[PDB]
């Protein structure tokens, strides 16, 4: 190797704006201007400028005076959640055990808005469109197995509101993407207590998911196992993966509550 | 210097957003707490007044970043999406991932990439600690790569400032011994740390450069004493790491 050489009065608007400015960077690989951030967030430019100035002084962002980027310190905000949340902490040995036994990826997600949000994953690579899925990433609820678990937990009025507004695009030719077929699908998921999705999010990808409850019988999250097409038989998901996942969900609930 | 002290250093700055700074500090107050917190606990750790802690928490609850039962407070998974904003907007982290995956597959060991934050290294990508986790720089192989990249004034400032605890019987724990170690890492272009952070842990790291020769980050492989000898690290792992890091630099910067 070569050497190394040389009103609500308690709502704090500026905190809200600063977190929205951080969110404006989602999926933007080129540094951003104030104009772009203001456009995306509908926050006035002068406030965006102050937010960025504050983030820079605190080590969360950087600039050349014209454009702006985030710094790695932003990752420590998510680490504050991961290291203070029993659900995320306790689920990791379970996902690791599921994955070691099945030699497939295992995940846990919650609902955030119209998407599922990954909170913990086993140690396997799962690439969507050759990009690793990761803790903190989001996927649409209507076309994922964990999304359908979490939509099934809604009451019918909330579910219909979601289906009349959501972007139901046909991700593959298999995807259920009209409100009547999604509603009937979600009703069966309720009856079953589990959901299989077969290549409705992307070609080649199959997953099976179950709910995780708290002591009150409320759905806190979903657990799943996710696989590629030629890695499984057609009925292995239900016969092989499902009892493992049901048992893990039951064990995690008992451990926490 | 408490979080409130650091915030109050900018009272003369009219564009510094005090509430944003306190809310970020309130999120940080949860680090490694393992469970939920009261207003009084958060105020004690941050030294931010309780009224302000209350208003920040309230704002986080309204925005979906936290929850409460009226006595204790917890963060919500939406906080994770703040870190994802960095990951999905940073080509270094994005492009590093296939290399880390391939390295880990070949060696059946964990491979990581880290940058320097303050006196710690900060993990920005890993292939099967977590991303966003931190470790001290002085007794880790990536830490020593990144300290080696500093100029000598910054390195000495670090060595006088940092808390150099003896974590194992092998840890180098004084500024003179550590400076000598860093000069050897500079001469080498790589670093092996053998059980200076915890028993059984051994790792090897190299720098990641841009096209102008700035060190941007460090890449490493970490192992246990079980079956990987130091000769293996230096003769088998090191050529792989050097090749991956050169590939990454060329892919990102030409
Ligand atoms: Cl920038
Ligand atoms: Cl298709
Ligand atoms: Cl189903
Ligand atoms: Cl429910
Ligand atoms: Cl303060
Ligand atoms: Cl303010
Ligand atoms: Cl709580
Ligand atoms: Cl959330
Ligand atoms: Cl190390
Ligand atoms: Cl030891």
TrEMBL record, chain B:
Key word Lipoprotein present: no
- Limits of the IclR-ED domain: 78-254
GO CC, sorted alphabetically, is:
protein-DNA complex
- Transcription as a keyword of this entry, yes or no, is yes
A molecular function (GO) term? sequence-specific DNA binding
Pfam hit, one:
HTH_IclR
Know the name of this protein?
A: Transcription regulatory protein (Pca regulon)
* Species name: Pseudomonas putida (strain ATCC 47054 / DSM 6125 / CFBP 8728 / NCIMB 11950 / KT2440)
């Amino acid at each position: 190797a070569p050497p190394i050489v040389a009103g609500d009065p308690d709502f704090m608007t500026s905190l809200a704006r600063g977190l929205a400015v951080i969110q404006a960077f989602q999926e933007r690989k080129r540094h951003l201007t104030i104009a772009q951030i203001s456009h995306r967030t509908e926050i006035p430019r002068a406030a965006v400028r102050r937010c960025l100035h504050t983030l820079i002084k605190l080590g969360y962002a950087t600039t050349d005076g014209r454009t702006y980027s985030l710094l790695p310190k932003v990752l420590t905000l998510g680490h504050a959640y991961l290291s203070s949340t029993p659900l995320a902490i306790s689920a990791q040995p379970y996902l690791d055990r599921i994955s070691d036994q099945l030699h497939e990826a295992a995940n846990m997600a919650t609902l955030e808005g119209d998407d599922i949000l990954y909170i913990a994953r086993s140690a396997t690579v799962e690439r969507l469109i050759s990009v690793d899925l990761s803790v903190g990433g989001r996927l649409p609820a209507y076309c994922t197995s964990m999304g359908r678990i979490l939509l099934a937990a809604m009451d019918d009025t909330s579910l219909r509101e979601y289906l009349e507004r959501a972007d139901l695009k046909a991700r593959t030719s298999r995807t259920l993407n009209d409100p009547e077929s999604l509603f009937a699908c979600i009703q069966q998921v309720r009856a079953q207590g589990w959901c299989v999705v077969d290549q409705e999010l992307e070609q080649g990808l199959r997953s099976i998911a179950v709910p995780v409850y708290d002591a009150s019988g409320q759905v806190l999250a979903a657990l799943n196992v996710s696989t590629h097409v030629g890695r499984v038989t057609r009925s292995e998901l239900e016969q092989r993966f499902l009892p493992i996942l049901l048992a893990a969900s039951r064990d995690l609930c008992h451990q926490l509550f």
